[PDB]
Paper text:
For 7 of the 20 compounds, it was possible to obtain crystal structures of the complexes bound to N-HSP90 with loop-in and helical (8, 14, 16, 18, and 20) conformations of the α3-helix region (loop- and helix-binders, respectively). The main difference between the structures is the conformation of residues 104–111, which can adopt either helical or loop-in conformations. All ligands occupy the ADP-binding site and form typical interactions, which include hydrogen bonds of the 2-hydroxyl group of the resorcinol ring with the side chain of D93 and with a water molecule that generally mediates interactions with G97. The 4-hydroxyl group of the resorcinol ring forms a hydrogen bond with S52 through another ordered water molecule. Similarly, compounds 2–5 were assigned as loop-in binders based on the similarity in size of their R1 substituent to compounds 1 and 6, for which crystal structures were determined. Interestingly, there is a strong difference in the binding thermodynamics of loop-in and helix-binding compounds. Specifically, “loop-in” binding compounds are primarily enthalpically driven, with favorable or small entropic contributions. The majority of the helix-binders (7–20) have lower association and dissociation rate constants for binding to WT N-HSP90 than the loop-binders (1–6), suggesting different binding mechanisms.
Numbering used by the authors:
A (entry chain A), B (entry chain A): 16 to 223
Amino acid sequence: EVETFAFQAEIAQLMSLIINTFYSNKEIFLRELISNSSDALDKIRYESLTDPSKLDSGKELHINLIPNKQDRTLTIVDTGIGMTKADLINNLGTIAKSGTKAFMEALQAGADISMIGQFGVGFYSAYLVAEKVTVITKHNDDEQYAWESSAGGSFTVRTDTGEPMGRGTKVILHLKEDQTEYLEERRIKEIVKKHSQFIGYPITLFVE
Amino acid sequence: EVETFAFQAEIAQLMSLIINTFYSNKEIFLRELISNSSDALDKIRYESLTDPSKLDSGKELHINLIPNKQDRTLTIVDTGIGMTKADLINNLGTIAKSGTKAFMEALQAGADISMIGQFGVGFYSAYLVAEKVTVITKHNDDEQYAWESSAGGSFTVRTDTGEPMGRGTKVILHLKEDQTEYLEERRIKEIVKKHSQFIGYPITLFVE
Ligand SMILES: O=c1[nH]nc(-c2ccc(O)cc2O)n1-c1ccccc1F
Ligand SMILES: O=c1[nH]nc(-c2ccc(O)cc2O)n1-c1ccccc1F
């Protein structure tokens, strides 16, 4: 059963701002999503220091970047702690209501959209480049779920039957027609080198 | 009973690097500790979104900066999630062994000590300015504890009987003799404005 939820008003406001504001420096979405993956990987690593069984769902701690020109998708996969159904519903594990308030105050006070991650709502920068985002996730304490939203004020959550992940999160960006540069190897390599050069996990850019 | 523990070798190495490297830009310690407080405050806020009773130990979410020229201490107080005894022993809730490895690799590859927070070990920047650090903490799931270290390869942990905190962490920096500028109101205000202007919680600088 596919469940449909309304975004909280503040989150719908954040998403409308991200989609409608004229702002050329879109490439920062990748750093934001890689940063979230790195934080999730730190969380499972920290839990494993006192309970090695936390890694029975997979010992490898990594980030993969998978472009697909046929499907027009860029997928960011991590083997981090994952998210429970409750975390997905609760703005993908963020304090997004308060984060949005601070971000919008900062934008009016002299800040730009690239600073979104300082407000803990960097995930939503995916909507700078994606028309639809699908998040497939598996936490050790829950089942595999798929969250999805094309903005418009709602998101869906369903159980994900296909391809079991073990543990982690996959963010599938269904790119806007005019944002296909983010599927080009040279462009992705450039962004990873510019903004994600000090991430403590291997980032593998898959080839097509 | 006061328990004495050895730092893991990598953490003792990190602390020796911080204490012995010639590096003038010491003021970044404050941003690092305020950043950790902000992360702890986000964690309790996130837990409270699904369980309001998480805030029975205190509803106020804030950061206080308390200089004391008589004791030569600068104390950073937060009402964040706090740390259990296990978190304190486990490098104050960090993945410090892996964080240190990445930080030292980066330093050799063209990075400086101000970038410590990108490696998740920013707490240890306290030793840029402090000869001794005492951390008093209270998590909802444990008792109030005091961690302490003057470096030298060990730290202690004890129960803290005095002044119950409710919930949070207090980092007491026992400043080095030549670092008393960090007790001056104008100097602290300057650092907070330069590096911590987008923190989503009130930061109150106490007066003497
Ligand atoms: O805790 C977990 N588990 N999985 C995630 C996760 C979220 C978004 C994302 O693009 C990638 C991720 O791996 N997070 C997380 C990370 C950062 C902030 C809040 C969070 F919930
Ligand atoms: O989770 C909690 N609870 N309390 C803390 C805490 C640690 C240091 C600090 O200067 C202030 C804090 O409030 N943290 C935390 C924050 C950042 C990284 C790892 C952590 F454990």
